[model samples]
Target: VSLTLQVENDLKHQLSIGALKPGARLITSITPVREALLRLVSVNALSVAPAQAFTVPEVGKRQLDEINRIRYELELMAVALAVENLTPQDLAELQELLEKLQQAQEKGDMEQIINVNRLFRLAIYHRSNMPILCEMIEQLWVRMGPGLHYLYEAINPAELREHIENYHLLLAALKAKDKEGCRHCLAEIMQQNIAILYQQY
Candidate 1:
């Protein structure tokens, strides 16, 4: 079948699943979702189709999965990469964001909660002083981040609020300069994300 049809089928299949459960392992990268979709469509437009079922090659799938895995690693790396470079100002900003997020979560303001979570991560990214890593992390958001929003919107708001709480744990871990703690927290955060994606699409 055409690649577009393949991707559409893939997305429909993936999205058919609901919220992600914890402890699910997702090895794919997020970067390819759009590209894969586009390619699928392009292939179809080119009239690449057959009666038999087609599958995306294993290599392509692996690369995409790697991208997904790196997306989370890049986030944690931003935190670790910045720890030595964190300024007093950076810490202050993080504290402010933490408070805002806590309030937003308590109020069940999903929009605000989303913004605060993003802001907190950026604060950490900038603090890391690794401009290249920071830039990459930011670009990942610009490129593939919206899938996360879709996931959140599709799930329970209360569960999303708990996610914010997980972000708080992340913030606390960052403040403590606990690298393992940071990794653990981010892993926890992203594991839910992967599960959600797995369930969704």
Candidate 2:
């Protein structure tokens, strides 16, 4: 079951930019981009159902919720896979991405920080070679944009700085090859942002 070339291209394009906002993360474009791939996969019998198969007004909401739920699970799996198979070059690339992310965060360059975050995660996911998980998480970024944006807005500068610092801690755990440490670091990272999610829920 092969995805259409257009679906592949659009999925790649969206995943490339979904973490960045302002010009790159337009809701209109992102939804259709993911739906296109989801539809293609469903039609190819690769996935359970297409987005079009759902007729409820809240279908998009349901899809988004499911994707977000899976995203965290995939994050853990991706990191475990990284620990199992990461090469020296992959580690170097991850370090480079972390430095850029740090610099961007210091400069209050949210766009670049987000892009770097995407780059690092995507690189690791690709290394894991789990195409379905990678694609699903990429779609989740689009689906979860609104909540992330709200969280960002809710955070003050000090909190944002702390969040960036935690990202570095996550990198440190990854560097040490400490699986539990890395998992805990990510849990801490998610805990901060998820407070807003809990509030909203």
Candidate 3:
């Protein structure tokens, strides 16, 4: 369970960053990656067939919206619960991620934007301390991030640039320990995120 979970985390990071890619498979000879892949398959991020294939799903607008809704609500809950729970260290890490995201945005590094932004938010969600909620949110991310981020890759960089401000609001809310404000900020970010995706659809 130890290394399997570790491998799954690594792959999820790859999936969330658009690195593993949709519908691509590795010809590998490692226990953890192959085993962890089945975990992804179960979550509907990666797919599998009888000893033959593995791939990420190409989620459509309808399914993307559904997953987005669940992911939004779950993360909102996570943030609200996390308000008082977030450590000073957690806030510092989030602050660091904000700088990283800003740098990536400046460089128009789409992949870096996706990865750092995910780490920023996941840092918040983990502070909620509800493993079950975090688990479901993580699954929703795997199910959504890869294909959706790919779509984002084709969209204008400006769309993403504006949203980094939303993360600033989120960090401010967290520092102020404003739970309700955090939820509202997060909701705005998530909704605006979909707005761009809607353009491509």
Candidate 4:
């Protein structure tokens, strides 16, 4: 019962930005799969019932907007704290991740793009020294994670390229200790996602 949160932790990250189709059943060869699926269901990341298969969430446009609005607000606070608390190591690592993201964009690899982008954002958010805030953000992430893959169909190459540039500016703002600049950059990226999402659903 103790390593229960660990199940959600693993599932949360796995579900985020990369995963199977909405109706696909997940594998469960290991132990404690029930507890894991139960916690994910409580968080609305997975849908399941007695003697039935588990499936991903069916996130609609309205649902996406509602969750993202709260997530955006929470992230604003997180970025401000990160701006003040982020270390040199954090910025350095972010720059490295940005380069990896750039490579993924060049290859047009959707999987790597989603995974790396999550890492890039989390790298900064974790440095904020706001564990509670981070957990809240992760909760919202779990809610949004499965639906994100659907976004790939709507994303265009030009928009994807533009995002890499925006991330560059965000990193620059972080290095310069520019809080407002960071917020502006963050909004740019998030709003871009909103635009693409609206176009899709």
Question: What would the TM-scores of all predictions be?
Answer: 0.60, 0.64, 0.85, 0.89
Cα error, residue 139 of model 3, in Å, equals: 0.8
Worst 10 residues of 3 by lDDT: 20-29
In candidate 2, which residue ranges exceed 4 Å CA deviation? 1-67, 151-158, 196-201
Worst 10 residues of 1 by lDDT: 15-24
Candidate 2: the clashing residue pairs are none
lDDT of each: 0.58, 0.60, 0.80, 0.81
Candidate number with greatest TM-score: 4
RMSD of 1: 10.0
Candidate 2 lDDT tens digits, 1-201: 233556656544443343323223223245555566555344321123333342111123455457556777878787767766777888888888888877877887756766677787788777777788777766656555544443344444334666667777877777788888877877677667555444544
Against the true structure, candidate 1 reaches a TM-score of 0.60
Q: Candidate 1 or 2, higher lDDT?
A: 2
Candidate 1: stretches off by over 4 Å: 1-66
State the lDDT of candidate 1 residue by residue for 69-187, as single tens digits: 77787887776776667667777788888889778767777566666666777777787778888767654443333344454556555665556667778767777777788878888
Error of 2 at 95 (Å): 1.4
User: RMSD in angstroms, all models?
Assistant: 10.0, 6.6, 2.5, 2.2
lDDT of 1: 0.58
In model 2, the worst 10-residue window by lDDT is 51-60
Top lDDT prediction, candidate number: 4
Provide the clashing-pair count of each candidate structure.
18, 0, 0, 0
